[PDB]
Point group: C3
Chain length 113, copies 3
Amino acid sequence: KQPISKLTRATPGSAGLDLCSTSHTVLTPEMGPQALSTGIYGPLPPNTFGLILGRSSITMKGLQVYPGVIDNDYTGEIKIMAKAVNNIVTVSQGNRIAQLILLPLIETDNKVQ
Amino acid sequence: KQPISKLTRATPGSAGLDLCSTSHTVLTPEMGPQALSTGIYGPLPPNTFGLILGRSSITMKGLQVYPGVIDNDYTGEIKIMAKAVNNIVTVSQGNRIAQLILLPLIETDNKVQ
Amino acid sequence: KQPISKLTRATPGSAGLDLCSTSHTVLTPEMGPQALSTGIYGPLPPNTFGLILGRSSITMKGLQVYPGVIDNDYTGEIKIMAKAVNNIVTVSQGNRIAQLILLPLIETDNKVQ
């Protein structure tokens, strides 16, 4: 288990922290959404939530990442929800597949239930 | 018609306000995107816009929610744009399908047209 | 090459700046993700990153836009990553296909690598 503070940013202007899967990824179109393990765990900095999105090179190779929302106080593993679009898609362990974007968590008066 | 202030947050750390459909949902892959009615209406708090995203349990069951963007002064019904990915997907009325995330609306000098 | 400052907002409450393709768009489901040229170039205002999302009318016509993330200091062309979902999708040059949403780029202590 590693926290998000261990994640790296490709460059200072990068919106996102890079996410890789811990295992070799073979996905076929008939499989439908698969949850890929990262071994990276919440929680997030105070007053922030996380959004998991694909990288564009990976999207273009036909690996779709479904938007993932990570709550501020989630302490579980961050997974990448991924689907092969058209073709069989393979991603080697340790290749960047997704990115974690941190966004402000706006407070509202909505009830909690 | 109910406003977004009636929506509930699963927990205080939840990024999103829960959205359900008002009707029973049967979706097949051949149907393509369907707009699911929530009976919840804009507008949004000042200086905010809304982003509609799927929940991860629902994504993993093969119901994809296409990112929805809700403008700050939209006064219409918030709908969930949904597609069955691989399999026939059923969702009972009142089961959480999507979430509304509120984000800051940054002001720019871009022209309005 | 035009900068994002030339983009227009449909209304003052619009979250997003409108994006069109520079060419006629014919997309079939078997083609998988295609990168549509906009002729609009980064970079983004300081302390912001960009998120590219589809418009909802276009989503509903069966043209899916994959979430695109634009880094703050990206100076290349903003492209729209698009896929025909179910049906052959045509979009005429100059019809709005996507939108660029500007979001705050939160600073973290994460390493840069």
